[PDB]
Amino acid sequence: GTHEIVDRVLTELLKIGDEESIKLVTEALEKGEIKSAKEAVEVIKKIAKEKGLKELLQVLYIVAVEYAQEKGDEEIDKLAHEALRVRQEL
Amino acid sequence: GTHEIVDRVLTELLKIGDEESIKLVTEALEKGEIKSAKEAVEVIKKIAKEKGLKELLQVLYIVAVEYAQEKGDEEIDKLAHEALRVRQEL
Amino acid sequence: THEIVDRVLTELLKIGDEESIKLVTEALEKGEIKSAKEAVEVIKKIAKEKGLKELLQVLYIVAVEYAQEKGDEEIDKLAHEALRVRQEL
Amino acid sequence: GPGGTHEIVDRVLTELLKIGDEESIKLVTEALEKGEIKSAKEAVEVIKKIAKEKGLKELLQVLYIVAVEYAQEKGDEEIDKLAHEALRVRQEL
Amino acid sequence: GPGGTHEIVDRVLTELLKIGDEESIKLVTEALEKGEIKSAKEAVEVIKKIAKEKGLKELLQVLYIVAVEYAQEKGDEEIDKLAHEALRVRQEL
Numbered sequence: 001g002t003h004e005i006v007d008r009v010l011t012e013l014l015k016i017g018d019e020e021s022i023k024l025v026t027e028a029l030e031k032g033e034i035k036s037a038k039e040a041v042e043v044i045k046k047i048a049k050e051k052g053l054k055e056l057l058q059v060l061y062i063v064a065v066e067y068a069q070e071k072g073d074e075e076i077d078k079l080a081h082e083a084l085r086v087r088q089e090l
Numbered sequence: 091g092t093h094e095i096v097d098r099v100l101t102e103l104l105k106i107g108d109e110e111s112i113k114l115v116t117e118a119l120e121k122g123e124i125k126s127a128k129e130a131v132e133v134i135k136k137i138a139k140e141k142g143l144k145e146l147l148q149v150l151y152i153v154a155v156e157y158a159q160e161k162g163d164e165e166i167d168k169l170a171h172e173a174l175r176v177r178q179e180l
Numbered sequence: 181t182h183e184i185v186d187r188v189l190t191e192l193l194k195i196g197d198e199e200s201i202k203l204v205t206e207a208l209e210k211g212e213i214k215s216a217k218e219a220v221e222v223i224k225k226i227a228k229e230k231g232l233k234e235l236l237q238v239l240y241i242v243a244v245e246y247a248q249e250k251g252d253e254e255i256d257k258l259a260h261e262a263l264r265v266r267q268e269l
Numbered sequence: 270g271p272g273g274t275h276e277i278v279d280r281v282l283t284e285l286l287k288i289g290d291e292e293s294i295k296l297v298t299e300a301l302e303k304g305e306i307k308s309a310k311e312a313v314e315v316i317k318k319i320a321k322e323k324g325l326k327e328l329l330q331v332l333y334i335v336a337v338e339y340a341q342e343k344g345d346e347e348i349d350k351l352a353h354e355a356l357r358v359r360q361e362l
Numbered sequence: 363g364p365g366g367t368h369e370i371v372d373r374v375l376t377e378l379l380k381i382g383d384e385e386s387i388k389l390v391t392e393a394l395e396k397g398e399i400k401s402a403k404e405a406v407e408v409i410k411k412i413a414k415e416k417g418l419k420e421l422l423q424v425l426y427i428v429a430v431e432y433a434q435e436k437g438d439e440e441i442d443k444l445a446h447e448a449l450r451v452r453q454e455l
């Protein structure tokens with residue numbers, strides 16, 4: 001759950017070589033800050049808004065919206081769209 | 091249903107950085123208008139024909155034929171081919 | 181029923197082959213393609229006459245993956261003919 | 270049998286088209302039409318030797334990828350061995 | 363056994379071909395051929411170690427992706443933990 005969102009975000013960040021978001025996301029994971037898939041999205045969303053990381057929010061939208069689709073989870077879908085909104089409003 | 095079409099369109103728009111189409115599509119989604127995948131294709135195709143958005147229609151054709159293929163939806167398949175006809179007539 | 185032509189147009193789009201999209205969509209409009217086999221035959225014939233190597237490339241890939249998916253030996257045979265027609269242009 | 274034959278050969282041909290390698294395409298399609306390839310294992314073996322003879326590191330790369338993924342799919346340990354062989358041939362060129 | 367070893371090693375090689383990392387391909391094939399690997403988990407540890415000692419950032423990126431997806435497939439928390447270690451080792455290189 002936690003790792004399912006986080007690990008995929010990490011993988012997608014490596015593909016675009018966003019090394020700073022990789023560092024920040026992994027820290028949040030290791031700080032014990034993530035206990036659910038839902039928690040992963042809000043934490044990663046918050047981090048990206050604070051540091052102005054448009055590509056992190058793009059990755060986050062894609063990963064969460066597919067996780068929500070795959071699991072039938074309406075809450076994750078909401079956070080994914082809200083991530084893009086943060087991305088727009090940067 | 092609705093989000094099945096819209097969310098993949100947004101994901102594909104993100105992959106090519108079509109920031110203009112992303113604005114319009116999430117705007118259409120947020121406006122509570124779209125109640126079905128068929129309405130999703132209709133609204134996006136009409137947006138993109140009005141604005142002359144070749145890349146949106148291409149993404150629309152692909153997302154909608156593959157959705158119509160998966161679920162057996164003759165109406166959506168028709169709408170995808172109409173998306174493509176408008177694009178070629180741009 | 182026309183699974184093959186849909187996958188062909190998606191691939192033609194990526195390479196921006198608007199002429200093949202046109203000619204392929206025309207064949208679809210007229211009711212010509214009602215099965216996988218007729219999909220490959222009609223598209224291969226159209227690519228042979230109009231001299232479209234890129235269409236035959238796309239058709240081979242699409243047809244051969246379709247054949248593998250469904251275990252359809254006649255489509256496989258058709259896919260390789262389209263490749264041969266390409267190699268002789 | 271031809272089931273495994275075309276799974277190897279057709280995916281190799283698909284990948285060669287993607288990189289535009291007409292030289293390999295002609296070499297593989299002619300070996301297939303000449304009856305040189307009657308099983309998955311022979312496909313790998315024939316394409317591997319063709320590529321070694323002509324120094325086609327790009328064809329061995331495709332062959333390795335297609336063969337090891339087929340070997341994992343079918344649990345075929347002989348395809349897997351040939352696949353690693355293809356990679357070694359590529360590496361020694 | 364050899365199944366899990368090759369599921370890890372073979373995909374790493376596949377991904378290394380895609381980025382053209384011939385230095386890593388050689389070091390990985392060398393470790394495979396030397397019977398130094400009995401399981402998927404050992405494959406990850408040995409590849410992670412080589413990549414640390416030779417400073418191979420790209421091998422570690424490939425290793426994380428291969429190992430973390432294998433771990434998800436197999437419900438294998440030990441291999442997941444290795445995958446994140448591989449990313450940390452890359453961060454310090």
Ligand SMILES: [Zn+2]
Nearest residue numbers: 003007430442
């Ligand atoms: Zn993990």
Ligand SMILES: [Zn+2]
Nearest residue numbers: 065077093097
């Ligand atoms: Zn959604």
Ligand SMILES: [Zn+2]
Nearest residue numbers: 155167182186
């Ligand atoms: Zn259609």
Ligand SMILES: [Zn+2]
Nearest residue numbers: 244256275279
């Ligand atoms: Zn074939």
Ligand SMILES: [Zn+2]
Nearest residue numbers: 337349368372
């Ligand atoms: Zn192997």
